[PDB]
């Protein structure tokens, strides 16, 4: 790992720490000992303290709206982060849009793992914790949203990545040269090759104990693509069949023509 590649890995790590409100160290500090949402009573209490304006509709629909707000926010964070990736800001604007379009939910579900344990997830900028069992207790189809994400996260967390790894993994997610509709595939593939090269060398240095960590992470990227495809299908069912579950226009555009 040359000085330029080590420097690039650190540059991406610092951009991640700057641009995402939550990181794995911060999440672990909080989780070690947030208001616990484990039933309808505590959900309603948390709404009045953490999202007061929202309740100043069915609980499931209220949760869905709050989730959309966090997704919109995360799109902003990921867009700023992408500027630290060598060559991203030099791409055609349309290609930057396409890469973020397909990458954002893969990145969201990867980063969600940092705030998940087997019992639930940290939410609302670190100020709430919503139990996995409470989410399973919601009426269909809303109880079907988070469980596959918990399943992904438990195995992803067993890899014991830190933020220096996760930042590069998120950058690699964004730099996929095989997204549909790309204009300058050749330059993107070169951008992808560079980020993946940095990721491979970083994992060799930071995880000398796990000689297969790089191919494990390539597989996780493929798993995330499938998780997002399935997630988009469920969101389409909810939007179409739930008269009160309208989609924020920015998210409508992200999901539109995706899969
Ligand atoms: C909205 C769909 C249509 S479905 C969908 C998508 C994502 C999620 C996870 C949302 N969430 C819980 C947000 C829970 C808010 C809480 C609800 C109860 C009352 C207090 C506030 C959360 O913390 N996300 C992190 C954000 C920081 C970066 C990593 C991801 C849930 C459903 C979509 O976007 O596709």
From Swiss-Prot:
Keywords for this entry? Activator, Biological rhythms, DNA-binding, Lipid-binding, Metal-binding, Nucleus, Receptor, Transcription, Transcription regulation, Ubl conjugation, Zinc, Zinc-finger
Its tissue distribution reads:
Skeletal muscle, liver, heart and kidney. Expressed in monocytes.
On the tree of life, the source organism's domain of life is Eukaryota
Changing residue 95 to A: reported impact? Reduced heterodimerization with RXRA. Reduced DNA binding
Q: How is it modified after translation?
A: Ubiquitinated by E3 ubiquitin-protein ligase HUWE1; leading to proteasomal degradation. Phosphorylated.
Give the span(s) annotated as Required for heterodimerization with RXRA: 95-224
Biological process terms in GO annotation? behavioral response to nicotine; cell differentiation; cellular response to fructose stimulus; cellular response to starvation; circadian regulation of gene expression; enamel mineralization; epidermis development; fatty acid metabolic process
**Family from the record:** Belongs to the nuclear hormone receptor family. NR1 subfamily.
Protein name in the entry? Peroxisome proliferator-activated receptor alpha
* Organism for this UniProt entry: Homo sapiens (Human)
Q: Which residues of the full protein are shown?
A: 200 to 468 of 468
